Amino acid sequence: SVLTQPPSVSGAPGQTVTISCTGGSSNIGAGYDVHWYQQLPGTAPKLLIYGNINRPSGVPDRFSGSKSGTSASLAITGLQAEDEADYYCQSYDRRLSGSWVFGGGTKLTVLG
Amino acid sequence: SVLTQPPSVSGAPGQTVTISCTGGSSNIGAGYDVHWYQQLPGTAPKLLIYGNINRPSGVPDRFSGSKSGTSASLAITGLQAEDEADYYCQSYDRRLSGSWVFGGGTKLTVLG
Amino acid sequence: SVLTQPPSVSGAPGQTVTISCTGGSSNIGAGYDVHWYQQLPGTAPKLLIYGNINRPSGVPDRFSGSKSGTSASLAITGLQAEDEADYYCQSYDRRLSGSWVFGGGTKLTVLG
Amino acid sequence: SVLTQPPSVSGAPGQTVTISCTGGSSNIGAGYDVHWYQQLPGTAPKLLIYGNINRPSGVPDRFSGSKSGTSASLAITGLQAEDEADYYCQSYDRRLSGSWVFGGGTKLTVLG
Amino acid sequence: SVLTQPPSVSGAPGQTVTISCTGGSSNIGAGYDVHWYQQLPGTAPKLLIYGNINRPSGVPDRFSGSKSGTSASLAITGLQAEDEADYYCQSYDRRLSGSWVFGGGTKLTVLG
Amino acid sequence: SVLTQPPSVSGAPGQTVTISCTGGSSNIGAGYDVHWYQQLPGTAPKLLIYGNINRPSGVPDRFSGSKSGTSASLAITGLQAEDEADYYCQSYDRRLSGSWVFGGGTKLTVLG
Amino acid sequence: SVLTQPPSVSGAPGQTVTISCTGGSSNIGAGYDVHWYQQLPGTAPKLLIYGNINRPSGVPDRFSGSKSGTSASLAITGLQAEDEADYYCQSYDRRLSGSWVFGGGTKLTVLG
Amino acid sequence: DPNANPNVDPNANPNVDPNANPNVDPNANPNANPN
Amino acid sequence: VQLVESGGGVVPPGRSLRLSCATSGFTFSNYGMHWVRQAPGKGLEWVAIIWYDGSRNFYAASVEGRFTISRDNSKNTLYLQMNSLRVEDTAVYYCARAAYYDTSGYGDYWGQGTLVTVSS
Amino acid sequence: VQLVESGGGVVPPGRSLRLSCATSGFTFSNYGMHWVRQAPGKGLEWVAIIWYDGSRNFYAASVEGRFTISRDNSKNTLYLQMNSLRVEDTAVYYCARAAYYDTSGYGDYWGQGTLVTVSS
Amino acid sequence: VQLVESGGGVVPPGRSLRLSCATSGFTFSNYGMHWVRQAPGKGLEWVAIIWYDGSRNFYAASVEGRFTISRDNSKNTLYLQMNSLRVEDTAVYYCARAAYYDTSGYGDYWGQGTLVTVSS
Amino acid sequence: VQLVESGGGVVPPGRSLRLSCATSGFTFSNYGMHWVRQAPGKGLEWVAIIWYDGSRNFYAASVEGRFTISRDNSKNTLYLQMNSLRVEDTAVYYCARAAYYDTSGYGDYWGQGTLVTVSS
Amino acid sequence: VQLVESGGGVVPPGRSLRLSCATSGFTFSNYGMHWVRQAPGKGLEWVAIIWYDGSRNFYAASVEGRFTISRDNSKNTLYLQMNSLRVEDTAVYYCARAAYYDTSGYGDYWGQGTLVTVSS
Amino acid sequence: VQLVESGGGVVPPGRSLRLSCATSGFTFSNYGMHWVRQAPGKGLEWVAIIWYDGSRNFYAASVEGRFTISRDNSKNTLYLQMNSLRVEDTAVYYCARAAYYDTSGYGDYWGQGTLVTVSS
């Protein structure tokens, strides 16, 4: 766990829920682009957001995000039951020998 | 001996002892991270603590430290017989051509 | 000539003589480090003092520096006949485009 | 309200009316330049007076300021119906974590 | 579209008109060279400008251009009726896998 | 024109004439250095004085100057027919964004 | 012609003259080696200098040269009447399809 | 200081700076960059 | 100098809302920016300032901890991030360009603002 | 320099179609080649490249895995094989000769193209 | 883009096991590849990268010297050789296609993964 | 230090014009540059400054947003792009080389100037 | 990670001695290396660094011009060539793996060292 | 550190001369270099500096535009090329190795120089 994410978020269908991702001077404040992935309960994760604000054509405009200082965020508007998933952020930490680092991951629960 | 260290420290098992390094405006007050090494009587130096506060893998939480102004410090709590050793600071000195500088080195004697 | 130096200084062997350099807010009182070079009649100048007070291991403790305000100075104690030389100050003048500025140069005659 | 202002001022078209602003040792007598803004009713409070007496080219030559000790002032001559506005003085409160303070605001009513 | 071009430009015969092409840090301000192509209404495009300022010997000196920061521009002087055409800019976006990227093109109409 | 200059100055060759330059607390009394330029009728202005008293080696010693408070001036001693020119002062105004600010200029007529 | 050479140089026998060759980042500053050829009025060009400084055994030491940045040069010392010739520089231009590129040639006239 | 004077200041010496260590700086990550 | 503002609208209390001020006619990166707000029926309350390079971030105590000021020099845009909005945070928010004369700051140009309403 | 194209026509979606560009006036084997396309009413889209010796191929993301580029140096011919054509692939396709300037490249010579229509 | 993991299973600790991914839909030889893993109940851990031409390899510190990454461009196949498997190496392993944006990279087309269990 | 102005002429009002200065005899890249102008019959007005590496651009308030300053160090050339020229912008434009003394700066070398007339 | 030194012994002053450090457990070619020494009664002295790709080398002032550092990636070996050994060069020499934290670096893995005696 | 100089001699005014400082005993490429000169009977005048990689060059105002400084790292050699020599340029020229302390720099090794005379 390099990037900090809350373990759990929730909201009722139709509400707006946001998921934070917090880094530091080594990996967000540092200037590295932040990426997000979505994992549905029984599948392989897929790219949701890239380049902090862009997204693959397969992603509905429900999702958007930002980067500010050491903070990053994924916002979900118009929350649907189908948005339940584990969300993860990704960046690059200058102090580590690897290429990618991930946050702990956040579970989004929809209060149906 | 770029960094100044006392030549010797001591204490009884169970006591808290400190080892410190004093630098100056070209090295510690200059913002270069301080790292510490431990050498046992018949071996090679081992990284003890780095990045001013991080303990690598196998170093027990007995060791901790800090950086402030031109001062740096290593604290050892719960001193054990096995802590008898030589401890050193390492940093970068802007006025010298070498990548690393070391302090003179301090020997810790456990008063068994 | 940027730094002001007396054209001449003298004394008998065993005496103490000093060579001063006077600048201004652009080059000594400016916080710029002052350096000294000693030139013997048949060769290139040799570094005597650097960093205002530090010196190469090839320089005997006969020489020392000093710095205050816009003034800087070289003291020579235990003057020997062999210390006859041209002494120069060097600094950096923030009002000029070059890297180094020199003083007029002072000629030390030892009254043997 | 940080800077003291009367709640109201009025006069007939063509007349001269004045708006007062009073502070203390923390914001007017303090030495902080006191500026004025004109909140025309359908917009933002554009700068009216700066430098205690001066004004933008976007301000009619009707307006001028004044400052002595804790007493700040704005005069409006040749009053027009179009000068109805909430006028605010502005300065900096020595004990403010933010950058600007405004007075209570004076409402100028034109009687015609 | 990767590079931004206005959809339309016009002017009377004899006038000077310009066509802009605005990119960003990924494709113009990135140090990549900008190229321009001319397409006449019923044929294949022709290289008009290359290397930001150069042109084929088959191009009259009516056409010239340059690049600054993230904005490139094609200047057309002495506009003639025969210069009515579609103009396109081209560069390379380091974030994409393709060798070339294009703007959306600009249609130049001569006001005869 | 933030530095006030007389529109005209004159005197017989051999006489001493001066050109004043009066600013405010924002551009002379602000601690900024005053500079002077000479413009001959068919060319660019050229530097006479810099740093209030210094001058390029290409300037004859006829030209000198000084400052105090918000006042500054250029003196021409031993005035020659060849000194007929437009003289301008230059400084930096604390309240403005431009690197240089100019005075209004003075026209020196040599009466002979 | 992509390398720039003066059209003509001259000097009296016994003089030293130089012939320049200036390119850009495409052909000299590029890191490409520069070569020189000598042509006499009724013959085929002969290799004079190769590899920037080397020369075939048929060339007297009168000729030498250098390369620095985008500049290159042929130096001729001990100028003789017999050195009247055209001199050409040669390189490789990374922007062109041909293996060799030339300057326009310089004619050296010896002022007998 | 909440009431420091803001914005980018003009009135500086923008003519490079011939007063800097011209030597190679031996203090950089010497490892391959996995990024 | 041209300042353009948007992002207002009605938001339930406890939720976030964010505003932006787009700028043109001048170099955005050469000047600091301010956000200020005027609750309906009230005078103007100062909210936040950011310097040209993000080096200074000052807030009124009344907004500190809920309001964040930020900017992106590549977009010529000033942003205001408001978290956990209170009903009391209803106001017309305005951007302005930072300026000073000798001893105090001021706005030398104002945008028109946008209204943020926080309500049940 | 001549670049001559052939092979357009109309197919139902799902079917393949092969295009080719014959060349002359220059040494084919010394140059890389490009294909671009222009849908009616649209601007230009880069489609594919293929170094001179066939060692490298790159495709636009929109067609990779669907289109194949190849060449036969002995016949001075460039080929483009499109499989599983979609309606969205309707365009005039053009071949062009690769050229390169400094930090980016360009096409210099262009053929006149051929029209490929994909439709029910 | 088709990325298919294969070669998982269960081994006693200390044993070796080789994983591989078959692929199509894109030109394998033009892209670098990544392996990541997810232990049951855990988040994601980056494991390794291989450059498009095999010239460089990097490993997570937690696996260096125990794991080897390699590829065969002629078979469109990515391989990972796991030696001396530890209990801690139990995880689902996935293959991903390297992508890069600006200051950092990302993956964008992952497989389904395969499970490797290490247990006595 | 030779500076050479070029590019004056007559501009119908509303139209743009580009000025530039070529330099030689000194290292161009080590110095910042200035433009000033002198309307006929008027004194000197500072117009713009660019730093040696383009890191800063300051403009007279009277021209900011209308005029742009830029450089190409490899050509020893300084450029000034003036858009929407007004009649009031008629002036002899001059180049000068940046210099600095202590608490304020100055120009040391000057060119000769070139005239831009804005008129119908 | 295992770093193993070799080549110590006793050499008359003036003569040369060559040391080496063989390594395993990690990718040798991705890391830079350091040599340090410890005189038999002293603390630690930094001696030299080599950049992972061999492009840079730095030496302690006490040995510059006398010692040479080099790598052979195909043998996973670090070498140190000492010429003109002086009596003051007696020490235990150690290799270590370069690591870097933020503003300064550090060594993480250390070898055992070997003793070089310069005498008689 | 050993610095060796050659290239002096006597030239008629207006002629060029090239000086060369050969070096050994240290890593040439890791340091910048300086030239100073001493006219007979005079003190020391700084002439020029070059950065270890040639990225920066500075000259005394007295010689800028007339003198050029350059390095050949491959041959461990420092050069100074003087054009249009003036009588005032007669001096012994010396090379030196760049060094730097904190707020200002210094040289710590000097060559022995060579004499350049400009005379009828």
PDB file of N, CA, C and O in Angstrom, chain H:
ATOM      1  N   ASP H   1       2.742  35.524   5.218  1.00  0.00           N
ATOM      2  CA  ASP H   1       2.128  36.837   5.350  1.00  0.00           C
ATOM      3  C   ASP H   1       0.929  36.985   4.403  1.00  0.00           C
ATOM      4  O   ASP H   1       1.117  37.122   3.185  1.00  0.00           O
ATOM      5  N   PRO H   2      -0.311  36.941   4.925  1.00  0.00           N
ATOM      6  CA  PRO H   2      -1.569  37.051   4.214  1.00  0.00           C
ATOM      7  C   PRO H   2      -1.694  38.331   3.409  1.00  0.00           C
ATOM      8  O   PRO H   2      -2.523  38.400   2.501  1.00  0.00           O
ATOM      9  N   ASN H   3      -0.882  39.346   3.712  1.00  0.00           N
ATOM     10  CA  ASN H   3      -0.972  40.553   2.930  1.00  0.00           C
ATOM     11  C   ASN H   3       0.392  40.905   2.379  1.00  0.00           C
ATOM     12  O   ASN H   3       0.753  42.079   2.276  1.00  0.00           O
ATOM     13  N   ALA H   4       1.084  39.884   1.891  1.00  0.00           N
ATOM     14  CA  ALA H   4       2.310  40.094   1.164  1.00  0.00           C
ATOM     15  C   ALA H   4       1.867  40.582  -0.186  1.00  0.00           C
ATOM     16  O   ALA H   4       0.744  40.299  -0.592  1.00  0.00           O
ATOM     17  N   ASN H   5       2.721  41.273  -0.910  1.00  0.00           N
ATOM     18  CA  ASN H   5       2.312  41.714  -2.229  1.00  0.00           C
ATOM     19  C   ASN H   5       2.520  40.598  -3.289  1.00  0.00           C
ATOM     20  O   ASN H   5       3.646  40.135  -3.457  1.00  0.00           O
ATOM     21  N   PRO H   6       1.436  40.136  -3.973  1.00  0.00           N
ATOM     22  CA  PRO H   6       1.337  39.040  -4.938  1.00  0.00           C
ATOM     23  C   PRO H   6       1.832  39.348  -6.326  1.00  0.00           C
ATOM     24  O   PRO H   6       2.148  40.494  -6.634  1.00  0.00           O
ATOM     25  N   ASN H   7       1.781  38.304  -7.159  1.00  0.00           N
ATOM     26  CA  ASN H   7       2.049  38.289  -8.600  1.00  0.00           C
ATOM     27  C   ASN H   7       3.524  38.085  -8.906  1.00  0.00           C
ATOM     28  O   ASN H   7       4.346  38.017  -7.994  1.00  0.00           O
ATOM     29  N   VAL H   8       3.850  37.934 -10.184  1.00  0.00           N
ATOM     30  CA  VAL H   8       5.232  37.719 -10.580  1.00  0.00           C
ATOM     31  C   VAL H   8       5.969  39.027 -10.696  1.00  0.00           C
ATOM     32  O   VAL H   8       5.558  39.911 -11.440  1.00  0.00           O
ATOM     33  N   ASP H   9       7.092  39.140 -10.015  1.00  0.00           N
ATOM     34  CA  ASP H   9       7.840  40.376 -10.101  1.00  0.00           C
ATOM     35  C   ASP H   9       8.699  40.520 -11.358  1.00  0.00           C
ATOM     36  O   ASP H   9       9.366  39.566 -11.763  1.00  0.00           O
ATOM     37  N   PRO H  10       8.699  41.704 -11.988  1.00  0.00           N
ATOM     38  CA  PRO H  10       9.568  42.150 -13.042  1.00  0.00           C
ATOM     39  C   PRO H  10      10.772  42.635 -12.282  1.00  0.00           C
ATOM     40  O   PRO H  10      10.772  42.536 -11.061  1.00  0.00           O
ATOM     41  N   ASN H  11      11.741  43.224 -12.950  1.00  0.00           N
ATOM     42  CA  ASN H  11      12.880  43.804 -12.249  1.00  0.00           C
ATOM     43  C   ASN H  11      13.764  42.763 -11.590  1.00  0.00           C
ATOM     44  O   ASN H  11      13.849  42.647 -10.369  1.00  0.00           O
ATOM     45  N   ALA H  12      14.407  42.007 -12.449  1.00  0.00           N
ATOM     46  CA  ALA H  12      15.295  40.919 -12.117  1.00  0.00           C
ATOM     47  C   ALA H  12      16.393  40.913 -13.150  1.00  0.00           C
ATOM     48  O   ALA H  12      16.322  41.674 -14.112  1.00  0.00           O
ATOM     49  N   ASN H  13      17.442  40.149 -12.911  1.00  0.00           N
ATOM     50  CA  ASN H  13      18.555  39.992 -13.842  1.00  0.00           C
ATOM     51  C   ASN H  13      18.441  38.771 -14.782  1.00  0.00           C
ATOM     52  O   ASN H  13      19.158  37.800 -14.565  1.00  0.00           O
ATOM     53  N   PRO H  14      17.621  38.752 -15.846  1.00  0.00           N
ATOM     54  CA  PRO H  14      17.378  37.607 -16.697  1.00  0.00           C
ATOM     55  C   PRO H  14      18.451  37.382 -17.717  1.00  0.00           C
ATOM     56  O   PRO H  14      18.169  37.380 -18.920  1.00  0.00           O
ATOM     57  N   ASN H  15      19.659  37.198 -17.264  1.00  0.00           N
ATOM     58  CA  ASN H  15      20.758  37.042 -18.179  1.00  0.00           C
ATOM     59  C   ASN H  15      21.605  35.907 -17.681  1.00  0.00           C
ATOM     60  O   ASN H  15      22.719  36.123 -17.195  1.00  0.00           O
ATOM     61  N   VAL H  16      21.056  34.698 -17.812  1.00  0.00           N
ATOM     62  CA  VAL H  16      21.563  33.487 -17.180  1.00  0.00           C
ATOM     63  C   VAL H  16      22.205  33.816 -15.840  1.00  0.00           C
ATOM     64  O   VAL H  16      21.792  34.764 -15.173  1.00  0.00           O
ATOM     65  N   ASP H  17      23.143  32.994 -15.388  1.00  0.00           N
ATOM     66  CA  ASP H  17      23.820  33.293 -14.142  1.00  0.00           C
ATOM     67  C   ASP H  17      25.214  32.663 -14.100  1.00  0.00           C
ATOM     68  O   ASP H  17      25.338  31.481 -13.779  1.00  0.00           O
ATOM     69  N   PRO H  18      26.296  33.390 -14.390  1.00  0.00           N
ATOM     70  CA  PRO H  18      27.652  32.885 -14.464  1.00  0.00           C
ATOM     71  C   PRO H  18      28.269  32.755 -13.088  1.00  0.00           C
ATOM     72  O   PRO H  18      29.336  33.297 -12.837  1.00  0.00           O
ATOM     73  N   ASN H  19      27.596  32.042 -12.214  1.00  0.00           N
ATOM     74  CA  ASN H  19      28.028  31.846 -10.849  1.00  0.00           C
ATOM     75  C   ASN H  19      27.419  30.587 -10.313  1.00  0.00           C
ATOM     76  O   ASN H  19      26.542  30.625  -9.454  1.00  0.00           O
ATOM     77  N   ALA H  20      27.828  29.475 -10.861  1.00  0.00           N
ATOM     78  CA  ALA H  20      27.247  28.210 -10.483  1.00  0.00           C
ATOM     79  C   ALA H  20      28.272  27.145 -10.673  1.00  0.00           C
ATOM     80  O   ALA H  20      29.183  27.301 -11.474  1.00  0.00           O
ATOM     81  N   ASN H  21      28.118  26.053  -9.967  1.00  0.00           N
ATOM     82  CA  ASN H  21      29.065  24.978 -10.060  1.00  0.00           C
ATOM     83  C   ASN H  21      29.049  24.399 -11.474  1.00  0.00           C
ATOM     84  O   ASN H  21      28.031  23.849 -11.878  1.00  0.00           O
ATOM     85  N   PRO H  22      30.133  24.516 -12.258  1.00  0.00           N
ATOM     86  CA  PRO H  22      30.248  24.077 -13.629  1.00  0.00           C
ATOM     87  C   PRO H  22      30.666  22.629 -13.753  1.00  0.00           C
ATOM     88  O   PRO H  22      31.007  22.164 -14.843  1.00  0.00           O
ATOM     89  N   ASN H  23      30.804  21.960 -12.623  1.00  0.00           N
ATOM     90  CA  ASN H  23      31.263  20.585 -12.576  1.00  0.00           C
ATOM     91  C   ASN H  23      30.089  19.627 -12.586  1.00  0.00           C
ATOM     92  O   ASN H  23      28.947  20.027 -12.368  1.00  0.00           O
ATOM     93  N   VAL H  24      30.345  18.371 -12.886  1.00  0.00           N
ATOM     94  CA  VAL H  24      29.283  17.386 -12.839  1.00  0.00           C
ATOM     95  C   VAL H  24      28.883  17.110 -11.407  1.00  0.00           C
ATOM     96  O   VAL H  24      29.736  16.851 -10.575  1.00  0.00           O
ATOM     97  N   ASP H  25      27.583  17.121 -11.134  1.00  0.00           N
ATOM     98  CA  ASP H  25      27.014  16.869  -9.805  1.00  0.00           C
ATOM     99  C   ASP H  25      26.847  15.360  -9.493  1.00  0.00           C
ATOM    100  O   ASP H  25      25.912  14.743 -10.001  1.00  0.00           O
ATOM    101  N   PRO H  26      27.698  14.724  -8.659  1.00  0.00           N
ATOM    102  CA  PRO H  26      27.728  13.298  -8.372  1.00  0.00           C
ATOM    103  C   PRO H  26      26.693  12.915  -7.335  1.00  0.00           C
ATOM    104  O   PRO H  26      27.018  12.265  -6.336  1.00  0.00           O
ATOM    105  N   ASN H  27      25.457  13.288  -7.572  1.00  0.00           N
ATOM    106  CA  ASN H  27      24.399  13.041  -6.617  1.00  0.00           C
ATOM    107  C   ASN H  27      23.075  12.879  -7.284  1.00  0.00           C
ATOM    108  O   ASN H  27      22.228  13.767  -7.234  1.00  0.00           O
ATOM    109  N   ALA H  28      22.910  11.770  -7.944  1.00  0.00           N
ATOM    110  CA  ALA H  28      21.717  11.514  -8.697  1.00  0.00           C
ATOM    111  C   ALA H  28      21.488  10.051  -8.658  1.00  0.00           C
ATOM    112  O   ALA H  28      22.418   9.290  -8.441  1.00  0.00           O
ATOM    113  N   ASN H  29      20.270   9.637  -8.855  1.00  0.00           N
ATOM    114  CA  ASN H  29      19.995   8.233  -8.804  1.00  0.00           C
ATOM    115  C   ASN H  29      20.806   7.545  -9.901  1.00  0.00           C
ATOM    116  O   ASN H  29      20.575   7.826 -11.070  1.00  0.00           O
ATOM    117  N   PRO H  30      21.774   6.670  -9.576  1.00  0.00           N
ATOM    118  CA  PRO H  30      22.649   6.000 -10.500  1.00  0.00           C
ATOM    119  C   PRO H  30      22.061   4.732 -11.050  1.00  0.00           C
ATOM    120  O   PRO H  30      22.760   3.942 -11.683  1.00  0.00           O
ATOM    121  N   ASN H  31      20.825   4.447 -10.686  1.00  0.00           N
ATOM    122  CA  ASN H  31      20.175   3.221 -11.099  1.00  0.00           C
ATOM    123  C   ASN H  31      19.383   3.399 -12.381  1.00  0.00           C
ATOM    124  O   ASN H  31      19.044   4.510 -12.781  1.00  0.00           O
ATOM    125  N   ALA H  32      19.102   2.307 -13.062  1.00  0.00           N
ATOM    126  CA  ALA H  32      18.260   2.394 -14.236  1.00  0.00           C
ATOM    127  C   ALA H  32      16.901   2.913 -13.822  1.00  0.00           C
ATOM    128  O   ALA H  32      16.415   2.579 -12.749  1.00  0.00           O
ATOM    129  N   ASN H  33      16.278   3.710 -14.678  1.00  0.00           N
ATOM    130  CA  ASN H  33      14.958   4.291 -14.432  1.00  0.00           C
ATOM    131  C   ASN H  33      13.766   3.475 -14.945  1.00  0.00           C
ATOM    132  O   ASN H  33      13.443   3.586 -16.123  1.00  0.00           O
ATOM    133  N   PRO H  34      13.008   2.738 -14.115  1.00  0.00           N
ATOM    134  CA  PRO H  34      11.922   1.868 -14.517  1.00  0.00           C
ATOM    135  C   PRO H  34      10.650   2.651 -14.750  1.00  0.00           C
ATOM    136  O   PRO H  34       9.582   2.256 -14.289  1.00  0.00           O
ATOM    137  N   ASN H  35      10.745   3.731 -15.487  1.00  0.00           N
ATOM    138  CA  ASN H  35       9.610   4.590 -15.727  1.00  0.00           C
ATOM    139  C   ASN H  35       9.774   5.333 -17.011  1.00  0.00           C
ATOM    140  O   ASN H  35      10.022   6.536 -17.016  1.00  0.00           O
TER     141      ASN H  35
END
